[PDB]
Enzyme design. Structure first.
Site, mmCIF file in Angstrom:
data_model
loop_
_atom_site.group_PDB
_atom_site.id
_atom_site.type_symbol
_atom_site.label_atom_id
_atom_site.label_comp_id
_atom_site.label_asym_id
_atom_site.label_seq_id
_atom_site.Cartn_x
_atom_site.Cartn_y
_atom_site.Cartn_z
ATOM 1 N N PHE A 45 -27.481 -75.605 -61.730
ATOM 2 C CA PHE A 45 -28.277 -76.158 -60.738
ATOM 3 C C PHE A 45 -28.666 -77.293 -60.041
ATOM 4 O O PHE A 45 -29.609 -77.395 -59.588
ATOM 5 C CB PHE A 45 -29.652 -76.105 -61.598
ATOM 6 C CG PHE A 45 -29.921 -74.633 -62.637
ATOM 7 C CD1 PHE A 45 -29.818 -73.380 -61.991
ATOM 8 C CD2 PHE A 45 -30.502 -74.906 -64.286
ATOM 9 C CE1 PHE A 45 -29.772 -72.242 -63.134
ATOM 10 C CE2 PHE A 45 -29.816 -73.882 -64.811
ATOM 11 C CZ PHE A 45 -29.784 -72.120 -64.360
ATOM 12 N N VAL A 46 -27.611 -77.670 -59.810
ATOM 13 C CA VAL A 46 -27.574 -79.470 -58.987
ATOM 14 C C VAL A 46 -26.734 -78.551 -57.906
ATOM 15 O O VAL A 46 -25.102 -77.515 -57.726
ATOM 16 C CB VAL A 46 -26.191 -80.141 -59.268
ATOM 17 C CG1 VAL A 46 -26.055 -80.984 -58.311
ATOM 18 C CG2 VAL A 46 -26.925 -80.501 -60.824
ATOM 19 N N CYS A 47 -27.208 -78.357 -56.573
ATOM 20 C CA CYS A 47 -26.544 -77.764 -54.933
ATOM 21 C C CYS A 47 -25.135 -78.525 -55.351
ATOM 22 O O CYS A 47 -24.666 -79.051 -55.449
ATOM 23 C CB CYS A 47 -27.481 -78.058 -54.045
ATOM 24 S SG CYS A 47 -27.066 -79.371 -53.503
ATOM 25 N N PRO A 48 -24.219 -76.899 -54.878
ATOM 26 C CA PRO A 48 -23.163 -77.263 -54.434
ATOM 27 C C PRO A 48 -22.820 -77.746 -53.083
ATOM 28 O O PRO A 48 -21.888 -77.177 -52.330
ATOM 29 C CB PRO A 48 -22.166 -76.454 -54.192
ATOM 30 C CG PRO A 48 -22.516 -75.075 -53.732
ATOM 31 C CD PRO A 48 -24.659 -75.899 -54.580
ATOM 32 N N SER A 49 -23.097 -79.189 -52.256
ATOM 33 C CA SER A 49 -22.942 -79.868 -51.282
ATOM 34 C C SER A 49 -21.879 -80.301 -51.259
ATOM 35 O O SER A 49 -21.198 -80.161 -49.714
ATOM 36 C CB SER A 49 -24.468 -81.006 -51.514
ATOM 37 O OG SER A 49 -23.747 -82.114 -52.321
#
Length: 174
Positions: A45-49
């Site tokens: 749920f952590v954006c794949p920046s």
């Protein structure tokens, strides 16, 4: 550790193609510089920046003859499924550079970025065309926000290979 040959590997991979295949670090010797980067997991749920920041800058890497390789301990099947998942729904969408699969955890381990025998820690590893590691970027320097520093180090690296270091001029042997 890593300073001679960067720890080699042979891993399963999903290409831009969305083709499966195999990749070895050595396939790039005398061909490409390699930017190998690590991220913990697919589908979190952590954006794949970092993956996106890099893919959005792909052309900048190709122009400098750099091959991008994204690595997580996930299987090639879940990379594929993650690419087939729209940004709108937590996926990475159709990124155009290859992702490889570290399913034995061996690669992360060889690069000393395996977090408690589970997932890989975020890291940017630049390797030259002779397979020698030029830098390791971690922690607060290992962010998607880092892409421009990365390209900058690649320019410096390529400039250093061309002209060498420069003397303090005033200094002499004797």
């Amino acid at each position: 550790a890593f300073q001679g040959q960067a720890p080699s590997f042979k891993a399963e991979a999903v290409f831009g193609d969305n083709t499966f295949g195999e990749v070895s670090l050595s396939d790039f010797i005398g061909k490409k510089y390699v930017l190998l980067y690590f991220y913990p997991l697919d589908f979190t749920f952590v954006c794949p920046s970092e993956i996106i920041a890099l893919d959005k800058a792909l052309d900048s890497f190709k122009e400098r003859n750099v091959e991008l390789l994204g690595c997580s301990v996930d299987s090639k099947f879940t990379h594929l499924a993650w690419k087939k998942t729209p940004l709108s729904q937590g996926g990475i969408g159709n990124i155009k550079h290859t992702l490889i699969s570290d399913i034995s955890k061996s690669i992360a381990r060889s690069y000393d970025v395996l977090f408690n025998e589970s997932v890989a820690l975020r890291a940017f590893v630049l390797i030259d065309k002779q397979g020698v590691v030029q830098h390791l970027l971690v922690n607060n320097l290992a962010l998607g926000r880092s892409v421009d520093e990365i390209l900058r180090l690649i320019d410096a690296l390529q400039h250093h290979e061309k002209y060498g270091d420069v003397c303090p001029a005033n200094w002499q042997k004797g």
